[PDB]
Paper text:
[name] targets the adaptor molecules, CT10 Regulator of Kinase (CRK) and CRK-like (CRKL) and its activity leads to severe changes in cell morphology, presumably by rearrangement of the actin cytoskeleton. Using immobilized metal ion chromatography we isolated hexahistidine-tagged ADP-ribosyltransferase domains of either toxin—ExoS233-453(E379A,E381A) and ExoT235-435(wt)—in complex with untagged 14-3-3β. The 14-3-3β:[name] complexes showed a similar distribution of various molecular weight species. We determined the structure of the 14-3-3β:[name] heterotetramer in complex with [name]; however, the model could not be refined beyond ~3.80 Å resolution. Our crystal structures revealed an extensive interface between 14-3-3 and the ExoS and [name] ART domains. Our crystal structures show that regions A of both ExoS and -T fold into two helices (α1 and α2), unlike the corresponding region with low homology in related toxins.
Two of these, exotoxins-S and -T (ExoS; [name]), are homologous enzymes consisting of an N-terminal GTPase-activating protein (GAP) domain (73% identity; 81% similarity) and a C-terminal ADP-ribosyltransferase (ART) domain (78% identity; 87% similarity). The ADP-ribosyltransferase activity of ExoS and [name] and their cellular toxicity are dependent upon association of the ART domains with 14-3-3 proteins. Here we present crystal structures of human 14-3-3β in complex with the ART domain of both ExoS and [name]. Collectively, our results indicate that 14-3-3 proteins act as exotoxin chaperones rather than activators.
Residue numbers in the entry:
A (entry chain C), B (entry chain C): 234 to 431
C (entry chain A), D (entry chain A): 3 to 70, 76 to 232
The structure:
Amino acid sequence: DKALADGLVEHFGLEAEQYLGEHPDGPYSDAEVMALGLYTNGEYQHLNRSLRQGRELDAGQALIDRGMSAAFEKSGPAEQVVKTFRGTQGRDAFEAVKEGQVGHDAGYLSTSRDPSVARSFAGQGTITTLFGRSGIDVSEISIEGDEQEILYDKGTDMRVLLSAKDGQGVTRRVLEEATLGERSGHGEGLLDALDLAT
Amino acid sequence: DKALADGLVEHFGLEAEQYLGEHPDGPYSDAEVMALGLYTNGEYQHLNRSLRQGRELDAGQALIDRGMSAAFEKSGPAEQVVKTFRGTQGRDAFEAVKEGQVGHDAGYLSTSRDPSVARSFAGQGTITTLFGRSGIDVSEISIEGDEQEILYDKGTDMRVLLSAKDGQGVTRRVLEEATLGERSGHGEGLLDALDLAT
Amino acid sequence: MDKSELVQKAKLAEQAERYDDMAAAMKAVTEQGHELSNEERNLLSVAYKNVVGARRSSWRVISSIEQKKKQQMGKEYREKIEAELQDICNDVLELLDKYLIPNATQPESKVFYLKMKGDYFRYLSEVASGDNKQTTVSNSQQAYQEAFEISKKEMQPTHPIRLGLALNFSVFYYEILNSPEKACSLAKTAFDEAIAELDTLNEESYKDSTLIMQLLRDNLTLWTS
Amino acid sequence: MDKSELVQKAKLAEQAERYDDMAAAMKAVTEQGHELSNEERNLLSVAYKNVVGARRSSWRVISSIEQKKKQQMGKEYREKIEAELQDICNDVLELLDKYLIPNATQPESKVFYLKMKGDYFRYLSEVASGDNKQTTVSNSQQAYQEAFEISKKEMQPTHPIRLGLALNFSVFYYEILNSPEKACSLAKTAFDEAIAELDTLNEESYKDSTLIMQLLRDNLTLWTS
Ligand SMILES: O=C(O)CCc1nc2sc3c(c2c(=O)[nH]1)CCC3
Ligand SMILES: O=C(O)CCc1nc2sc3c(c2c(=O)[nH]1)CCC3
């Protein structure tokens, strides 16, 4: 769909053309590269600030989101479980989920695998650490600050495996993609063999 | 409440006065005796035909129902589990209850302990056999045909312990008052001691 | 040990879930040579059942894996379980034949024990081979139908022991003799004789009997589909 | 028996739920004198645990009824269970000290076994009396804290064996020594050292470790209320 690819060059120009040949191999389209790049960093904070709150999209941002979510089925998954990270200035969309259950954000899920950008990335309020595959390895298109990013979808459901609060009061949390679940990431019988109190 | 007692003598007369001194002991009131007698047999078929279908009451029947349900708290329960019976011309309010669960009629639950009036009492379509205590032992006020009747309330919930259909196709059923349940009527461990297949 | 001390020690092994102790425990109160009340009659049956059913659940799994590269030592291991059950039933059948069957003064227990004795003849008939394979089944139907006429001519239809005896009998034909023709034939007869007489229920176990009937209707249709 | 034949026979007793067989089963592969992989390392621990936990669940009930008219023969019966567990742990502790503890070439299992050895010293410390009462606990904290510095200085914080070793240690103080002061003191330390380093999780058991952490937070607050 070249018309979509023109949508950004009709609305962003040299900004959209910043990303283009950022592609050795190309599992994604021309329109898919510029769209993912536009989100990643930094034209994205308001893509989720508008997704969340159920608010209406802008002209360009609607051109982004549709190009973005489209590339997801065209990208995910493969191939094993990864270990991303994500910190916030407080209030994350997983503070209302009961421990052990599954919940999904409204907006997207930009992350990083580097523990330094994990602690933090404006701010150090609530820190998380994720697991999955359905993330878009954009660690090539936009690595501002060398963040090596992997981006999951939006209504993708996450399993809150743990929710505690730090001594200094930074809520560190563990998550897990819904479609993993059950015995996805368990030492084969190491648990039963420990013997515990419970 | 003598005014209620006058309600029947202002609307039925010698009919209502048919029952009165039908009482050695008297756990019930003057108005309670005539009301229960009026239902029992035979001014009752339309008390339930109107209760069911959610239809509106008549003048006298409203005077009955209110006098009847009032005597229930004033009567029930005591003292052990009884064994009433009830047959119908087909379609009973327990054919939609799943086996093992609890359901309650809209109208009342006139019954008998005599297996002959059980098979039947217009007609032989669906036959039942009940268990409880919250029934009004009216086996003194109106024993037309020597039926020795015990009458439960209306929205009283029954546990369908069994629902089968006969060789000749008469659906015999077992029931049980909700507030009994669990191990109410089990041989103490006789079941576990039989050993079975299941 | 007093006839009442072992009662407490028997109840212990049950709550402690130590039925192998409960096995020899209730074994002794019957070795006393005196009749046992239904309270103790229930406990002993509950004891040996949980024991036999435990080895049964153990044996039945091995007999699925071997069927489903060496597996001889697996059959050799299955054999020691066979050896366990054989040792159990024949041990309890003597306890039936020595101190249980004759002491049956009450007519009710006259059917519970014979039903149980046929069960333990039905139990042993699965792991058997050749010599005992045909022999164990002979006394199986013997003791079964023996208590059945007692249940037929003396016992109420809707009676827990009678209805249970019919089920285990109906299961014996389908499982052991692999003859669902007579298995289904005996359940309906018993089932039918039950629904016609609903005034035959006792409030002491009115709910206990209905459960049994809920099983037979779930075995007739099951066998006929 | 080959070093691999018993593997199948060991897996049998597990599925068959015949862990008393599994006890002597995995007992033999370690009597071979050669190191056992984590696969077998898990099975043996799973074996003796289910056995000991079974007698444990059995013993713990008797020790509630007697506390809650003769009850001497009940204590006499509880004593034979005490005799069972004592026979078990000390038997498995020699298997730890003979073929398990020295064969620990891998640094990971260097903490699993010591944790386990302290557990079976923690197990025996409940039914003991006088002579062993104080003695068993001496090697208990000995083996416990011994593996702890290994877990501290060598093992990752968010590691299943390390986090489990901390829990069983935190349970040892509250239960055995009845000292919730240091029990709560050791869990928070371990718990805190876990949340600060979340990048220390391994995808192989990332979900396995979180469960352990979900237990300690449910023991600190529990002990502090
Ligand atoms: O606004 C949001 O959608 C969540 C806030 C948030 N945004 C981003 S972008 C990015 C990261 C990040 C984040 O942790 N939170 C981590 C590496 C690149
Ligand atoms: O109309 C109804 O409420 C149910 C039909 C019905 N009515 C009566 S009255 C009576 C009996 C009875 C019944 O079995 N069904 C049995 C002894 C006295």
